[PDB]
C-alpha cells in the first residue's frame, strides 16, 4: 500500500536517530548521569586529583547559591583540565547547568550526580540552575572560571 | 485511490526532522 | 439532548476556558517577566513563580482534564446515540469543580507556589494536593459509571458491530488515564498529602519525581488522544462533505499504540536525574521513539483523509501531488469550515512539536536542552498548538450546536488560529534557539537578575532571545482574545433553533472489522504488563540503591519501599477491573 | 514583436537576474558574516566590504536600472502598440552591458570596495565611476530616442485621447530619472572621476554626500514607479478577468505626486550630517511626509481595484468588508495567477517598508535608527519586498510570453514569494529590533569583532539579534533559489507557440479625461523648479558655510562652488529639454 | 467619495506624526546636528568646562579608532554630567554612534558635528562607528565610561 | 459601487503605523 511506505519511512528515520544516539552514548562517551555510590556524604568540596589536568569537583548546591569551594560561588581551574564533577543538593531538587559544556544534571537530595567533562576552551563557564528551588532562585548561579 | 500526496508530504517530514534533530545533535557533539 | 446534560457540557466547556483566561493572562505576563521588561518580582500581587504555578496548573490540569470529560460526554453520547446519565454527570462535575476551586484557592493566595509538577521536597498546602487529586480522580466517575455501561449495552445489543471510532478513541484515552492515575494518586496520597499537614516528616525526593513522570508523561497522550479523535472523525467532514477518513483500521491501530506505548515512556523526562540507573533511561528513550510512531501514523492517516476529502470534491485535482493543500478551506467561514482554521493551525504547530519532542527524547541530546527554554518550545507547540486549538474549535462548535447560537463573530474565530500559530512561531522560535545556544533556562524569573543590566548576575547574551519573544507573547495574546470574544459572543446569544448534540463524524473510507485490535481487553492487559515491566528497575532505584537519606519539606521562601510495591500491586491488579470492564 | 527586440528584452530580463544571483549569494553570506558564524574577514576571496559593494551595486544599480529599461521597452511598445526601434535598443543595451561589466570588474577584483554609495573621500577605481555613470546614462537613450517619439507620434495621431496609464507611468518614471541623473552625473564626473586618476587632489566630502542623496533618493521612487505601473495595470487583471483598476485619475494623480515630490526629498538621508543647516532638514522631513502620501493613495487605489475585481467575480461578496482578501488567488497556478503570489507577498513587505520609511524620515526619530540595522529593514522590505518581487513576477511572465514557453516549474514559482516574504520577515524583524534597542550598526563586519566572544570589542547583547536573523537569510536564499529555478526552466525550453509581447492590462473602472494632470509639461516644470528651490540651501552649505577645507582621497586599506552652480544651471536648463519633449 | 476618506485619514496621520516630531525637536530640545562654526581646527580634546556637570568633549575620529583624550579610546566622566560633544573626523566620513544616548552624528572631514547630551544613568556608553571607513572598520569603537 | 473594504483596511493601516512609529518615537524620548 502507501501506509507501508509511510511506515518504512518513519521507521528508517527513527532507527537512524536511535542508532546515532546510542553511538554517541557508547563511543565518544557522552554519558548521561547514572547511579554512582561509594560513600558520598557530600557537603564540601574540591580536589586537585592528578595535578595538572584531572580534578574532582564537588558542587554542593545549597538553597539559592552553589558551593564550589568552601563557600565560594566562583572557582578557577587551569585550561584543558578534565574535571570529575559531582553534584548533590543540600535541601531541595536543584538544577546544575554548566552553560559551556553539556553538563546538565539535577542535584536531588540524597543523590550524587556524577559526570566527567573537560574544559578544552578557556573562558568562564556559568553554572546556572534551572529547576525551581523557591524564591531567590533567579539569583542562583556561579562561575567556573577557566583562564 | 492512491494517497500519492501524503507520501511526498512525509518525504518532506523526516527530512525536516533529521535536519532539526541533526542540528541539535551537532550542538551535542560540539559541546565539550 | 437532555436539559441538564446540556448544562453539564456547557459548564465543562465554559468553566475551563473561563479559567484558562488567567492561564493565558499570566502566560503573557511571563513572556514579559522572562524577557526583562516587567522586571521587579511580582505584579498585581501574583509573583512570578506563583503565577507560573497557575499558568501551568490552570492550563494543563484544570483546563484540559475538564474539557476532555466535557467533550467526551458529548462525543460518546452522540456516537453511541445514548442519552447520558444525569445523576452521574452531576457528581462528576461537582468533584471536578470542587477540586479545581480547592486547587485554585491556595494557589492564588500563595499557599502552593510549588509548581505545576510539585517537585518535592518543596511541598504545598494540602488543599493543593487533595484539590488536584480530587479534580483528576473525579473525571473517572463518568468513564466508569456512565459510558462503560451504555457502551457495554450498545455493544451487546448489535452485537456484531465494531465500536465507533469516536468512542473507541475515548475508551483508549480513558483506559490510559485510569491506568496512569495510579502513579500520581499514589505519590500524592502517600508522600505529599502525608508530608503536608505533617504526618510523615520525610520524603524520597527521587521516588516522588519518578511516580510523577509515570503520570506526567501519559497525560500528554491523554490530552493528545481527544485531539486525535477529532482529527480522525471531525476533520474529514469539516473539509468537504465527501470526506471519508481513509483507513479506519489505521486509526484504530494508532490508538492501540497510544495505549501500549504511552505508559512505559515516562522515564525520558528525568534523563538527567542521578539516581535512576542509566540503561533504563535508554530503554525509555527507545519506548519514546516507539510512542512517537503512532503520531507518525496519524500524520499519514489524517493527511490522506485530508487528501481523499479534497480530491473528492475536486475531481480535477485527481492524481496531483502538492497542488491540493491549496484547495483546503484555510480561512473559510460559513458552516463547519471555520474549524479547519483551528485544525490546520494546530497541525502545523504539531508538526514542529513533534520534531522537538523527538529531539528532546534522544537521551544523549537531552543534555543539550533539558530544562532550557527549549522544552517550552516543545510543549507549547504540542499542547497549545494542537491540543489547545482543537479544543478551542470544538468548544466553539459545541457551545454553538448545543445552545442554538449559530456562531457569533465567526470571522474573529477564523482569524484566531493564525494569530495563535504565528505568535507561537515568533515565540517558540526565539526561545528554542535561545535555549539551545545560550542555555536560557526554564522556570526562572530571568528578567529580574539574569537580564537586569545592573545585577551582578547579568549574562548579556540572553537579552536578544528574550526580547524577540515578547512579540510572540503579544501576538498570541491577541490570538486568544479573538477566540475568547468569539466564544463569549457564541455562548451569550441568541437561541435560534433546537439545542441538539450534533457532530460531523466522517466515516471510514477503508473499513475493516479487524478483531486483533478492536479488542481493548488483551491490549489493556498488554499496556498494564508493559509499563510495569518497565518501571520495576527505576522504582527499584529511587527507593533503594538510589538514595542515601530522606528529606524534610521546604517551603518556597525559607531554607527549612512499600510506597512503591503498593503502586505496583495496584497497577497489576487494575487488570481485574479493566477486564471485567 | 520583432526578432531582435525580443533578444534585447530577453537580455535585459536575464542578464540582470543572472547578475543578481551574486547579489543574493553575498546577501546570504552577509547575514552570516554579521551574525558571527562565518567570522574571519573574507570568503572565497571576496572580503565583507567588497562583497557588500557587490550586494549593493549589483542589486540596486545594475539589476533594477536594467530590468526597468527592459520591462519599459516591453510595456511601452505594447501599450502604444508601436514597434520598438532596434538601432536604438541596441546601443542602449550595449552601453548598459559595457557599463555593468566595467563596474563589476574593478569591484570583483577589489579596486572599488568603496560601497554602493561611494561616500567620498573614499575613492574607487575610475572604471567603477565611469562604469556606473555609463550604466545609468545609457538607459536614457531608449527614453529620448525610442519612445519619446512613437509616443509623440501615437499621441498626435489620435489626437484626443489620454496617454495610456502604462506608458504615462513610464513617462513620469523616466522624467524623474532624467532629472535625478543630473546630480550624480555631476558629482561623479566632476568630483570623483577627477579625484580618481588624480587630476584634482581635493574633494568636498560633504558636497559629494549631498549631490548624492539628490540621486540616491529619487532613485527609490524611480524603481517604485514601475512596480506601481504593474500594481495598477497588471494586478487587477491577474486577479479575475473582470478587474478594472478603480479610479484611473487617482493613479495618474499618484504618478504626478511621485513626479513633483520625489525630487526635493533627498536631504532626509543625511539628517545627521553636521554641515547642512538644520531647518532645511526639517523642510525635507516635511517633503518626505509629502512623498509618502502618493504611496498611501496607491494603497487605496490598488486595494480597491483588488476589491472591485474580487467582488466582480463573486457577487455573493457584495457589500462585505473583510471577507474578501480571502477569495484572492494567493497560491493559484494556472494562468496569469501565479503572479498574484508575487504581487501580494510584495504588497505585505511594502506595508512594512512604508511604516519603516515613515519612521526613518521623522527627522527627530532618525537619530534612533540612522545607519543602525533598522535601515536594512526599511530598504529590504521596500526594495526586495515589492520592487524585487514585482520585477520577479514580470520577469517570469515576459520571459514566458515573448519566448513561447508557457511557464515551467510554476509551482516552485508560486511558492517563491512566500519563502521570500517569510525570510524577509524573520530577518528584518530581528534586525529592526536589534538596531533600535542595541544599536546594531550597519555596514559592519560585526561578526569578526563585535560578536567574537574573544575579541576585546565584544558587545554581547548583539548576539541574539544577529543569530536570529541567519534563519531569515537561509529562508530567503531558498525563496530566491525557487524563483531562479523557475526562471531558468522557463527561459530554457520548449517553444510551443508564437512569441508575442502580451500583457494583462486592466482598464479604468472610473475613467476621466482630466487635463490638469495628463499634462507632463507644466508638471515636469513644477518638479524641476521645486527640488531646486529646495536644494539651494543645502548646496549653499556643503559648498560654503559648511566646510573648512577639502580632503584628499583615501583608499579603503590605508590611512593616506562652480561644482554646484553647474548642476543648478543644469537642472534649471533641463526645462527646455523636457518641454520641447 | 471614499478616496477623500482615505486621504483625510492619511493626512490626519501624517500631520500627527509631523506635529509630534516638530514638538519634540522644539520643546524638550532634541536637536538634530546643525551647522556650528566658531574656529574648530580640531585634532585633540576634552575640557572640564563648568566643573561638576558641564563638559566639552572633542571626539576626533581618526581612521580606525576614536580619540577621546590625547589618544585614549576610552574616557571616564562623572554621573549626571551634561557633555557638549563635538565630532570631526581626520580623514574620511566616520559615524559616531553613542549607543546609550541618541547621539548619532557623522564626522565629515572639515565639519564639526555638535550635539549636547547628558549622561543621566551611569554605566558604560560604547561609541561605535557605523558608516563605512575602510577595512579595520569593524574594530573601531571606544567607551565613554560614566561610573 | 462603494469600496467599503479598503476604508477599513486603511483604518487598520495608520493604526499599525502610529503604533510602530510611536514605539520608535518613545525610544527617542526615553534616550537621554
Ligand atoms: C506582528 C509582529 C511583527 C513581526 C511578525 C512578522 C510576521 C508577520 C506575519 C507574516 C505573514 C503575514 C501575511 C499574511 C498573509 C500571507 C498570504 C497567505 O497566507 O496566503 C496563503 C499562503 O500562506 C503562507 O504561507 C504565508 C505565510 C507566511 C509565509 C510562510 C513561509 C513558510 C513557507 C511557505 C509556506 C507556503 C507553502 C509552502 C510549504 C512548503 C495561501 O493560502 P491558500 O490556501 O493557497 O489560498 C487560496 C485562496 O485563493 C482560496 O481560493 C482558497 O479557497 C483557500 O481555501 C483560502 O485561503 P486563504 O486565502 O484564506 O489563505 C489562508 C492562509 C492564512 O495565512 C496566514 O496568515 C498564516 C501565516 C502565518 C500566520 C500569520 C499571522 C499574521 C496575522 C494573521 C494573518 C491572517 C489574516 C489576518 C490579517 C489581519 O492559510 C495559511 O497560510 C496557513 C499557513 C501555512 C504555512 C504555515 C507556516 C507559517 C510560518 C512559517 C514558519 C515560521 C517560523 C520560521 C522558523 C523556522 C524556519 C523555517
Ligand atoms: C499533549 C501534550 C504533549 C504531547 C502530544 C507531547 C508529545 C511528545 N513529547 Fe512531550 N516531551 C518529550 C518527548 C515527546 C515526544 C517524543 C512526543 C511525541 O509524541 C511527539 C510525536 C509527534 C509527531 C512526531 C508529530 C508528527 C505528527 C503530526 C500530526 C504531523 C502533522 C502532519 C502534517 C502533514 C499535517 C499537515 C499540516 C502541516 C503541518 C503540513 C520529552 C523528551 O524527553 C520531554 C522532556 C525533555 C526535557 O528533558 O524535559 C517532553 C516534555 C513535555 C512536557 C514537559 C513538562 C514539564 O515542563 O517538564 C510537556 C507538558 C509535554 C507535553 C506533550 N508532549 N512534553
Ligand atoms: C524602492 C526603494 C525604496 C522605496 C520605495 C522607499 C520608500 C521610502 N523611504 Fe527609503 N528611506 C527613507 C524614507 C522613505 C519613505 C518615507 C518612503 C516612502 O515612500 C514609503 C511610503 C510607503 C507607503 C506608506 C506604504 C503604504 C502603501 C503600500 C502599498 C501599502 C500596501 C497596501 C495594502 C492594503 C495592500 C494589501 C496587502 C497587505 C499589505 C494588506 C529614509 C528616511 O529618512 C531613509 C534613510 C534613513 C537613514 O537615516 O538612512 C531611507 C533609506 C532608504 C535606502 C537607504 C540607502 C542606504 O542604505 O542609506 C534605500 C535603498 C531606500 C529605498 C526605498 N525607500 N530607502
Ligand atoms: C514537481 C516539482 C518538485 C520539486 C520539489 C523540490 C523540493 C526541494 C526541497 C525544498 C522544500 C520546499 C518545498 C517546496 C515545494 C515545491 C513544490 C511546488 O511549488 O510545486 C509543486 C506543487 C505544484 O505542482 P503539482 O501539484 O504537481 O501540479 C499539478 C498540476 N495540475 O506545488 C503546489 O501547488 C503545492 C504546494 C503546497 C502549497 C502550500 C500552501 C499553503 C501554505 C503552507 C503549506 C503547508 C502545508 C504543506 C506541507 C507540505 C509541503 C509540500
Ligand atoms: C465585524 C467585526 C469587526 C471587529 C474588528 C476588531 C478589530 C480589532 C483590532 C485587531 C486587529 C486585527 C484584525 C483582525 C480582523 C478581525 C475581523 C474578522 O475576523 O472578521 C471580519 C471578517 C469576516 O466578517 P465579514 O467579512 O463582515 O462577514 C461577511 C459575511 N458574509 O473577516 C474576514 O473573513 C476577513 C479578514 C481577512 C483575512 C485575511 C486572510 C489572509 C491572511 C493575511 C491577511 C492580510 C490581508 C488583510 C489586510 C487587512 C486586515 C483586515
Ligand atoms: C532546532 C533549533 C536549532 C538549535 C540551534 C541551532 C541554530 C544550532 C546552530 C548553532 C549551533 C552552535 O553551537 C553555534 C555556536 C556558535 C555560533 C553559532 C551556532 C549556531 O548557529 C532551532 C529551530 C527551532 C524550531 C525548529 C523553529 C520552529 C519554528 C516554529 C516553532 C514553527 C514554524 C515551523 C513549522 C515546522 C512550520 C512547517 C510548515 C511549513 C512547511 C512551513 C515551512 C517551515 C520549514 C520547516 C519548511
Ligand atoms: C519597530 C520596531 C520596534 C522598535 C523596538 C521596540 C520593540 C521598542 C520596545 C522597547 C524599547 C526600549 O527602549 C526598551 C528598553 C529596555 C527594555 C525593553 C525595551 C523595549 O522593549 C520593531 C518592529 C519591526 C517591524 C515593524 C516588524 C515587521 C515584521 C516584518 C518586517 C513583516 C511582518 C509585519 C507586516 C506589517 C505584515 C502585516 C500584514 C498582516 C496584517 C499581518 C499582521 C501583522 C501585524 C502588524 C498586524
Ligand atoms: C497564550 C500565550 C502564552 C504565552 C505567551 C505563554 C508563555 C509561557 C512561557 C514564557 C512559559 C515558560 C515559563 C518558564 O519556563 O518559566 C510558559 C510555560 C508554560 N506554558 Fe505557557 N504561554 C502561553 C500559553 C500557554 C498555553 C495555551 C498552554 C497550555 C494549554 C501553556 C502551557 C504552559 C506550560 C504547561 C508551561 C510550563 C509551566 C511550568 O514550567 O511550570 N502556555 N508559558
Ligand atoms: C535574499 C536575501 C538577502 C539577504 C539575506 C540580504 C542580506 C543583507 C544584509 C544583512 C544587509 C546588511 C549589510 C550591512 O548593513 O552591512 C544587506 C544590505 C543590503 N541589501 Fe541585501 N540581502 C538580501 C537580498 C537583497 C535584495 C534582493 C536586495 C535588493 C534588490 C538587497 C539590497 C540590499 C542593499 C541595497 C543593501 C545595502 C548595502 C549597503 O548598505 O551598501 N538585498 N543585505
Ligand atoms: Cu537552586 Cu533553582
Ligand atoms: Cu570609522 Cu567606520
Using a CB–CB cutoff of 8 Å, tell me whether A2 touches chain B.
yes
Look up residue D265 and give its three cell numbers.
526629498
CB atoms within 10 A of CB C94: 12
Q: How far is A63 from chain C (nearest CA, A)?
A: 7
Residue nearest atom 67 of ligand 1, based on CA coordinates: C418
Secondary structure letter of residue C546 according to DSSP: S
Give the atom of ligand 9 at the shortest distance from the alpha carbon of D442.
15
Phi/psi at C142 (nearest 5 deg)?
-60, -60
For the residues of D508-557, what is the DSSP string, one character each? -SS----SSSS--TTTHHHHHHTTTTTTHHHHHTTTSSS-SS------TT
Chain A residue numbers with beta carbons less than 8 Å from the beta carbon of C448 are 138
Secondary structure letter of residue E82 according to DSSP: B
Residue nearest atom 40 of ligand 9, based on CA coordinates: D443
Residues in contact with D569: Cβ distance below 8 Å, sequence separation at least 6, in sequence order:
none
Using a CB–CB cutoff of 8 Å, tell me whether A5 touches chain B.
yes
From the candidates D443, D450, D482, D484, which is the catalytic residue?
Answer: D443
Using a CB–CB cutoff of 8 Å, tell me whether D272 touches chain F.
no
The answer to whether the annotation marks E131 as part of a ligand binding site is yes
d(CA D274, CA C49): 51
- Name the helix (H) or strand (E) containing A96: strand A94-98
CB atoms within 10 A of CB D324: 16
Exposure string (b/e) for D491-500, b if CB count within 10 Å is 16 or more?
Answer: beeeeeeebe
d(CA C499, CA C5): 11
Look up residue A12 and give its three cell numbers.
528508517
Secondary structure letter of residue D372 according to DSSP: B
Give the atom of ligand 5 at the shortest distance from the alpha carbon of C412.
19
d(CA C92, CA C135): 9
Nearest to C468 among D323, D461, D465 (CB): D465
3-state SS string over D114-180? CCCCCCCCCCCCHHHHHHHHHHHHCCHHHHHHCCCCCCHHHHHCCCCCCCCHHHHHHHHHHHHHHHH
Phi/psi at E47 (nearest 5 deg)?
-130, 135
Report the largest interatomic distance among the alpha carbons of chain E, rounded to a whole angstrom.
67
Using a CB–CB cutoff of 8 Å, tell me whether B27 touches chain C.
yes
Q: SS3 of C150, please?
A: coil
Look up residue D248 and give its three cell numbers.
484611473
**What residues of C are labeled active site?**
217, 221, 378-380, 442-443
Distance from the alpha carbon of residue D414 to the mean position of ligand 4, in angstroms = 9
Cβ–ligand 10 contact at A107 (below 6 Å): no
Secondary structure letter of residue C62 according to DSSP: I
- CATH number of the domain at C3-580, please? 1.20.210.10
Residue nearest atom 39 of ligand 7, based on CA coordinates: D348
Cβ-contact D481, D489 below 8 angstroms: no
Cβ-contact D130, D216 below 8 angstroms: no
Identify the domain containing residue F27 by its residue range: 1-32
Pick from C203, C209, C222: which is nearest to C60 by CA? C222
The runs of H, that is alpha helices, within D314-402 are 339-361, 366-369, 374-381, 388-401
At CB < 8 A and 24+ separation, what contacts does C321-330 make? C321/B4, C321/B5, C321/B7, C321/B8, C322/B5, C322/B8, C322/D411, C323/D333, C323/D411, C324/B5, C325/B5, C325/B9, C326/D331, C326/D332, C328/C239, C329/C238, C329/C239
Distance from the alpha carbon of residue E35 to the mean position of ligand 8, in angstroms = 54
Number of CB pairs, chain D paired with chain F, less than 8 A apart: 65
d(CA C333, CA E23): 47
Residues in contact with C454: Cβ distance below 8 Å, sequence separation at least 6, in sequence order:
none
Residues in contact with C71: Cβ distance below 8 Å, sequence separation at least 6, in sequence order:
C12, C13, C226, C391, C394, C398
Q: With CB atoms and an 8 Å threshold, state whether E2 touches F3.
A: yes
Residues in contact with C492: Cβ distance below 8 Å, sequence separation at least 6, in sequence order:
C405, C408
- Residue D45 CB burial class (10 angstroms; 0-12, 13-18, ≥19): exposed
Distance from the alpha carbon of residue D276 to the mean position of ligand 8, in angstroms = 52
Secondary structure letter of residue A82 according to DSSP: B
The runs of H, that is alpha helices, within chain E are 3-26
- Residue A52 CB burial class (10 angstroms; 0-12, 13-18, ≥19): exposed
The answer to whether the annotation marks C55 as part of a ligand binding site is yes
Q: How far is C462 from chain D (nearest CA, A)?
A: 7
Look up residue D544 and give its three cell numbers.
560654503
Residues in contact with D86: Cβ distance below 8 Å, sequence separation at least 6, in sequence order:
D2, D4, D5, D8
Radius of gyration of chain A (CA): 19
Distance set, CA D54 to CA D43, D57, D166 (Å): 14, 5, 32
Number of H helices, E strands in chain D: 25, 0
Cβ-contact C60, C223 below 8 angstroms: yes
| Residue the block writes with cell 556561579 | A142
Using a CB–CB cutoff of 8 Å, tell me whether A18 touches chain B.
no
Q: SS3 of D487, please?
A: helix
- Helices C64-79, C218-233: axis angle to 10 degrees equals 40
CA D135 to chain CA centroid, nearest Å: 15
Using a CB–CB cutoff of 8 Å, tell me whether B31 touches chain C.
yes
User: Please, what is the Cα angle at D181 between D175 and D185, to 5 degrees?
Assistant: 155
| Number of domains, chain F | 1
Q: With CB atoms and an 8 Å threshold, state whether E120 touches F32.
A: yes
d(CA C312, CA C317): 9
Bridge partners for C476 per DSSP = none
d(CA A110, CA E122): 46
Secondary structure letter of residue C190 according to DSSP: I
Cβ-contact C212, C477 below 8 angstroms: no
In this structure, are strands A85-89 and E113-115 parallel, antiparallel, or unpaired? unpaired
**Ligand 7 pocket residues where CB is under 6 Å:** C 37, 467; D 348, 351-352, 381, 425, 428-429, 432-433, 436-437; F 16, 20, 23-24, 27, 30
- Name the helix (H) or strand (E) containing D237: helix D235-238
Q: With CB atoms and an 8 Å threshold, state whether D205 touches E108.
A: yes
Say whether the peptide bond before residue C244 is cis (omega within 30 degrees of 0). Answer: no
Say whether the peptide bond before residue C121 is cis (omega within 30 degrees of 0). Answer: yes
Cβ-contact D34, D444 below 8 angstroms: yes
Q: How far is D205 from chain E (nearest CA, A)?
A: 7
- Residue E19 CB burial class (10 angstroms; 0-12, 13-18, ≥19): exposed
Radius of gyration of chain C (CA): 23
In this structure, are strands A113-115 and E46-47 parallel, antiparallel, or unpaired? unpaired
Domain ranges of chain D: 3-580
Secondary structure letter of residue C59 according to DSSP: I
Bridge partners for A89 per DSSP = A61
The ligand whose atoms approach the alpha carbon of A90 most closely is 10
Residue nearest atom 16 of ligand 5, based on CA coordinates: C412
Look up residue C72 and give its three cell numbers.
467526551
Q: How far is D463 from chain C (nearest CA, A)?
A: 6
d(CA D534, CA D98): 35
- Helices A3-26, C294-313: axis angle to 10 degrees equals 150
Look up residue C299 and give its three cell numbers.
500524520
d(CA D370, CA D359): 11
Pick from C130, C154, C148, C178: which is nearest to C88 by CA? C148
Amino acid at each position: 500500500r502507501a501506509e507501508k511506505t509511510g511506515l518504512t519511512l518513519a521507521l528508517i528515520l527513527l532507527l537512524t536517530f536511535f542508532s546515532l544516539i546510542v553511538y554517541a552514548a557508547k563511543g565518544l562517551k557522552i554519558d548521561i548521569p547514572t547511579c554512582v555510590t561509594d560513600v558520598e556524604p557530600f557537603q564540601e568540596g574540591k580536589l586537585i586529583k592528578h595535578g595538572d589536568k584531572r580534578y574532582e569537583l564537588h558542587i554542593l548546591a545549597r538553597m539559592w547559591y552553589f558551593d564550589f569551594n568552601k563557600g565560594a560561588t566562583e572557582i578557577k581551574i587551569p585550561v584543558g583540565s578534565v574535571v570529575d564533577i559531582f553534584t548533590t543538593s543540600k535541601d531541595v531538587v536543584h538544577g546544575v547547568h554548566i552553560h559551556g559544556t553539556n553538563y546538565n544534571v539535577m542535584a536531588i537530595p540524597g543523590t550524587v550526580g556524577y559526570m566527567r567533562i573537560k574544559f578544552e576552551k578557556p573562558g568562564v563557564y556559568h553554572v546556572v540552575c534551572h529547576e525551581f528551588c523557591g524564591v531567590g532562585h533567579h539569583a542562583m548561579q556561579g562561575k567556573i572560571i577557566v583562564e | 485511490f492512491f494517497p500519492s500526496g501524503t507520501i511526498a508530504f512525509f518525504i518532506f517530514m523526516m527530512v525536516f526532522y533529521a535536519v532539526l534533530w541533526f542540528m541539535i545533535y551537532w550542538v551535542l557533539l560540539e559541546r565539550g | 439532548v437532555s436539559n441538564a446534560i446540556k448544562f453539564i457540557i456547557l459548564t465543562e466547556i465554559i468553566f475551563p476556558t473561563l479559567l484558562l483566561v488567567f492561564g493565558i493572562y499570566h502566560g503573557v505576563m511571563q513572556v514579559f517577566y522572562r524577557s526583562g521588561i516587567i522586571k521587579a518580582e511580582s505584579f498585581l500581587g501574583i509573583d512570578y513563580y506563583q503565577g507560573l504555578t497557575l499558568h501551568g496548573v490552570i492550563n494543563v490540569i484544570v483546563y484540559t482534564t475538564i474539557f476532555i470529560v466535557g467533550f467526551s460526554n458529548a462525543i460518546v453520547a452522540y456516537s453511541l446515540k445514548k442519552p447520558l446519565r444525569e445523576k452521574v454527570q452531576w457528581i462528576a462535575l461537582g468533584m471536578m469543580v470542587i477540586g479545581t476551586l480547592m486547587a485554585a484557592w491556595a494557589m492564588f493566595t500563595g499557599r502552593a507556589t510549588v509548581l505545576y509538577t510539585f517537585y518535592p521536597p518543596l511541598i504545598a498546602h494540602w488543599t493543593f494536593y487533595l484539590g488536584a487529586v480530587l479534580l483528576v480522580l473525579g473525571s473517572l466517575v463518568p468513564f466508569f459509571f456512565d459510558w462503560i455501561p451504555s457502551a457495554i449495552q450498545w455493544k451487546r445489543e448489535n452485537p456484531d458491530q465494531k465500536l465507533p471510532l469516536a468512542v473507541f478513541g475515548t475508551f483508549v484515552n480513558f483506559i490510559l488515564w485510569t491506568i496512569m492515575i495510579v502513579p500520581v494518586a499514589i505519590e500524592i496520597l502517600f508522600q505529599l498529602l502525608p508530608l503536608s499537614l505533617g504526618l510523615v516528616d520525610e520524603i524520597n525526593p527521587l521516588l516522588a519525581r519518578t511516580l510523577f513522570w509515570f503520570f506526567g508523561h501519559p497525560v500528554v497522550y491523554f490530552w493528545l488522544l481527544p485531539a486525535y479523535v477529532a482529527l480522525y472523525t471531525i476533520l474529514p467532514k469539516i473539509v468537504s462533505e465527501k470526506g471519508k477518513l481513509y483507513s479506519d483500521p489505521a486509526a484504530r491501530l494508532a490508538f492501540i499504540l497510544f495505549l501500549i506505548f504511552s505508559l512505559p515512556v515516562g522515564l525520558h523526562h528525568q534523563f538527567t536525574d542521578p539516581g535512576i540507573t542509566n540503561t533504563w533511561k535508554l530503554i525509555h528513550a527507545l519506548f519514546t521513539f516507539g510512542v512517537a510512531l503512532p503520531s507518525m501514523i496519524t500524520a499519514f492517516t489524517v493527511a490522506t483523509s485530508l487528501e481523499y476529502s479534497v480530491k473528492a470534491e475536486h475531481p480535477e485535482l485527481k492524481n496531483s501531488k502538492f497542488y491540493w493543500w491549496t484547495f483546503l478551506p484555510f480561512m473559510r467561514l460559513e458552516g463547519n469550515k471555520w474549524m479547519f482554521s483551528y485544525f490546520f493551525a494546530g497541525l502545523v504547530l504539531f508538526f514542529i512539536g513533534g520534531i522537538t519532542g523527538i529531539v528532546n527524547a534522544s537521551y544523549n541530546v537531552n543534555l543539550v536542552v533539558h530544562n532550557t527554554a527549549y522544552v517550552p518550545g516543545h510543549f507549547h507547540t504540542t499542547v497549545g498548538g494542537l491540543v489547545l486549538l482543537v479544543f478551542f474549535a470544538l468548544s466553539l462548535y459545541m457551545v454553538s450546536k448545543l445552545r442554538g447560537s449559530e456562531v457569533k463573530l465567526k470571522g474573529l474565530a477564523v482569524l484566531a488560529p493564525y494569530f495563535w500559530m504565528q505568535g507561537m512561531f515568533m515565540f517558540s522560535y526565539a526561545m528554542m534557539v535561545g535555549g539551545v545556544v545560550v542555555g536560557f533556562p526554564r522556570r526562572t524569573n530571568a528578567g529580574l537578575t539574569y537580564l537586569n543590566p545592573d545585577s551582578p548576575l547579568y549574562r548579556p547574551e540572553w537579552t536578544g532571545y528574550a526580547q524577540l519573544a515578547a512579540v510572540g507573547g503579544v501576538l498570541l495574546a491577541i490570538g486568544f482574545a479573538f477566540y475568547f470574544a468569539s466564544l463569549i459572543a457564541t455562548a451569550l446569544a441568541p437561541k435560534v433553533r433546537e439545542s441538539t448534540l450534533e457532530f460531523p463524524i466522517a466515516d471510514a473510507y477503508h473499513d475493516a472489522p479487524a478483531p486483533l485490535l478492536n479488542n481493548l481487553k488483551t491490549w489493556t492487559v498488554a499496556a498494564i504488563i508493559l509499563a510495569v515491566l518497565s518501571y520495576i528497575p527505576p522504582l527499584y532505584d529511587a527507593s533503594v540503591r538510589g538514595v542515601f537519606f530522606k528529606s524534610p519539606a521546604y517551603n518556597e521562601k525559607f531554607p527549612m519501599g512499600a510506597e512503591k510495591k503498593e503502586e505496583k500491586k495496584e497497577l497489576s491488579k487494575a487488570e481485574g477491573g479493566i477486564t471485567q470492564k
